[PDB]
Design a binder for this molecule. Structure first.
Ligand SMILES: *[C@@H]1O[C@H](CO)[C@@H](O)[C@H](O)[C@H]1NC(C)=O
Ligand SMILES: *[C@@H]1O[C@H](CO)[C@@H](O)[C@H](O)[C@H]1NC(C)=O
Ligand SMILES: [Ca+2]
Ligand SMILES: [Cl-]
Ligand SMILES: [Cl-]
Lengths: 529, 177
């Protein structure tokens, strides 16, 4: 009972029965594909090998290769809990191997259960599904939770912009995991006809991209897209060849033929590859999803504008102050920001995201105007909030709403949230509002257990209850396509009323989340160019 | 005519399947088949409509005694016709339609498969399928004759209508032979 065994289509695995809410059966380090090593580096993943006898899946496998280094790290894009706690985080990635396509299954003891599959990721360069324990969400929701590992960074996303290396290996890995799940979850008491995929940040970007790919067909029916989209500056790499070349030249693969260049890269030791510094343009990525024409068949903006996606039940949202890091270094003793720093900050923003000469004097002045509280224009703390708002609006809210509108417009059931809570901690200054990543502890029930090394929050009864509310909504959605239904009412989102749930201690339905600011970014700023 | 047959008499009638609003399929490929008999030169037989606001649709019809399908998935109307087999003769016939993005097939009985390959780039998704209307009353071209063996993307719609499925509304002069 204690070490339960499940016969998968590749052979039997042995897991653990773990108490915490009933106990959960944990199957850790399950292989879902063949190692993408040797000839199969920079190739699509292949199914895994089968075996006779019983295979212990009772501890996490080696993680995918990654080199965590302040100054190589994409700080602005990583969630706060990651960057705040990176010593005790390097702990989860210290055991690496190119052979890393493994997933983990959390099965509640208690017909056929819904399956929530989590796609982790901050910047496409780092992480592991292993740092999220799915046990509480599984046991609380009576759903199977699966976490995955997919190829990261270079090994996961290197592309030449031609046939030599088409890219998207990490996305293909997520697809292969979902194929495994479709064919094998039944054996764990899962229902393949009720698979919700979900993720936060770059993981959310993957989830959005996967909803646009023909490869996803039949592999899942619902998605929850937390704090990321396919439309941000950092979701997709539009200039892969450029960065691949910089890498190749650094490691001595200078051949001009892209086919020979890839084979040379393919024979290099991976450690040599990940140790290099390839720094991308501000707010962009050097290695990540690319528009290859097959997996992702066109610019996601175009695909979504045009309605080229199937009908997934979709839930998406954003946190109040995602963009905390945008005010790094300019907040004073009194938690304020000066006018000169406000100007400089908007000026640099314009240079980084709208680098067109000219028209940018205009744009800069307009942005400043839009992000000044004309009813309290002297208050330095408000100046600070507005700056965090500028970046949060631009990188997260505007594209989330753009995405929500287009799903809703083509008839897919859509649900939108604004997350206005976060735990008290030292990971973040006390004046900060909910930052990038702060929802994660609530989605996964962490308050139900206590603070952990990654989330060293001081939780209150309120935190426990808000977590209960969030998990109920999330798992209800997994069950029925409606967060209100297991077999406060959160109204559906359509672009007419644009109702959304304000998630906080007191949840409430509201409408047109920051509509004027979203309009500013989606409507005015484009004209003006 | 095999299995569940419905007769459509003078003045017209209709059989409507509504998808639950939380579950309207979007498809990249479709498949439609039906058995029929009619003496009419003009009728709409079956029509699948996207939700209100969206233009996408698929329509099985008879025009000048010839069976065909007209559909649209976001680019233009695309038409496909069996323009030789006379099918308005009171005798039983089968029509099978296939769509794959902008491309389509049609065949009648054992005649050669008609294929249509529209020129220029084509949208491929039929979004948010809301209703399957059988009978042509709404389109102003009521069908008169018999229908059986309706299959649309796995849905055996006429059986569902025979077994009082919640989502089916039967109106007008239509009888369950
Ligand atoms: C699997 O790990 C368990 C953990 O205690 C161990 O007892 C068992 O011997 C291992 N597997 C095999 C095949 O022996
Ligand atoms: C949690 O809040 C309490 C309230 O006084 C205080 O002890 C401190 O802020 C936190 N406790 C711990 C152990 O960090
Ligand atoms: Ca369409
Ligand atoms: Cl403002
Ligand atoms: Cl606003």
């Amino acid at each position: 009972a204690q070490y339960p065994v499940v016969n998968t289509n590749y052979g039997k695995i042995r897991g653990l029965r773990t108490p915490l809410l009933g106990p959960v059966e944990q199957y850790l380090g399950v292989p879902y594909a063949s190692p993408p090593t040797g000839e199969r580096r920079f190739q699509p993943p292949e199914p895994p090998s089968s075996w006779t006898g019983i295979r212990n899946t009772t501890q996490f496998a080696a993680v995918c290769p990654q080199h965590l280094d302040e100054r190589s790290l994409l700080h602005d894009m990583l969630p706060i809990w990651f960057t705040a706690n990176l010593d005790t985080l390097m702990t989860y990635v210290q055991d690496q191997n190119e052979d890393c396509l493994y997933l983990n299954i959390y099965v509640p003891t208690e017909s056929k259960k819904p399956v929530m599959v989590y796609i982790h990721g901050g910047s496409y360069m780092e992480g592991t599904g292993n740092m999220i324990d799915g046990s509480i969400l599984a046991s609380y929701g009576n759903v199977i939770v699966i976490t995955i590992n997919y190829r990261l960074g270079i090994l996961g996303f290197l592309s030449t912009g031609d046939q030599a290396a088409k890219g998207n290996y990490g996305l293909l890995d997520q697809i292969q995991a979902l194929r495994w799940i479709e064919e094998n979850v039944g054996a764990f008491g899962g229902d393949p006809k009720r698979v919700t995929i979900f993720g936060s940040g770059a993981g959310a970007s993957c989830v959005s991209l996967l909803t646009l790919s023909h490869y996803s067909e039949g592999l899942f029916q619902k998605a929850i897209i937390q704090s990321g989209t396919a439309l941000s500056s950092w979701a997709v790499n539009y200039q892969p060849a450029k960065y691949t070349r910089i890498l190749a030249d650094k490691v001595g693969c200078n051949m001009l033929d892209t086919t020979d260049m890839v084979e040379c890269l393919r024979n290099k030791n991976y450690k040599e590859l990940i140790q290099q510094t390839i720094t991308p343009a501000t707010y962009h990525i050097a290695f990540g999803p690319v528009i290859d024409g097959d997996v992702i068949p066109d610019d996601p903006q175009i695909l979504m504008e045009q309605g080229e996606f199937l009908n997934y039940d979709i839930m998406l949202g954003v946190n109040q102050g995602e963009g905390l890091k945008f005010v790094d270094g300019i907040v004073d003793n009194e938690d304020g920001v000066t006018p000169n720093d406000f100007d400089f900050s908007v000026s640099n923003f314009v240079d980084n995201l709208y680098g067109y000469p000219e028209g940018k004097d205009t744009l800069r002045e307009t942005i400043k105007f839009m992000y000044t509280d004309w009813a309290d224009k002297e208050n330095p703390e408000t100046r600070r909030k507005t700056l965090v708002a500028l970046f949060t609006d631009h990188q997260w809210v505007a594209p989330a709403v753009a995405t929500a509108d287009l799903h809703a417009q083509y008839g897919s059931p859509t649900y939108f949230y604004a997350f206005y809570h976060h735990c008290q901690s030292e990971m973040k200054p006390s004046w900060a509002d909910s930052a990038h990543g702060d929802e994660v502890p609530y989605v996964f029930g962490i308050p139900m257990i206590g603070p952990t090394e990654l989330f060293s929050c001081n939780f209150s009864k309120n935190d426990v209850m808000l977590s209960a509310v969030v998990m109920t909504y999330w798992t209800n959605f997994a069950k029925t396509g409606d967060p209100n239904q297991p077999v406060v009412a959160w109204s559906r989102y359509n672009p007419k009323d644009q109702l959304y749930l304000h998630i906080g201690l007191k949840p409430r339905v509201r409408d047109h989340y920051r509509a004027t600011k979203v309009a500013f970014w989606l409507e005015l700023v484009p004209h003006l160019h | 005519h095999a299995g569940t047959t419905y007769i459509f008499s003078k003045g017209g009638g209709q059989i409507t399947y509504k998808w639950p609003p939380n579950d309207r399929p979007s498809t990249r490929a479709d498949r439609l088949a039906i058995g029929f008999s009619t003496v009419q030169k003009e009728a709409v037989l079956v029509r699948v409509d996207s939700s209100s606001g969206l233009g996408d649709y698929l329509e099985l019809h008879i025009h000048q005694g010839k069976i065909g399908v007209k559909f649209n998935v976001g680019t233009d109307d695309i038409a496909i016709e069996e323009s030789n087999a006379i099918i308005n003769d009171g005798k039983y016939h089968v029509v099978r339609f296939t769509r794959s993005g902008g491309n389509a097939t049609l065949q009648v009985d054992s005649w050669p498969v008609i294929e249509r390959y529209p020129a220029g780039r084509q949208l491929t998704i039929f979004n948010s399928q809301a209703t399957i209307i059988i009978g042509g009353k709404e389109q102003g071209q009521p069908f008169q004759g018999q229908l059986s063996g309706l299959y649309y993307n796995g849905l055996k719609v006429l059986n569902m209508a025979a077994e009082n499925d919640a989502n089916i509304a039967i109106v007008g002069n239509v009888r369950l032979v």
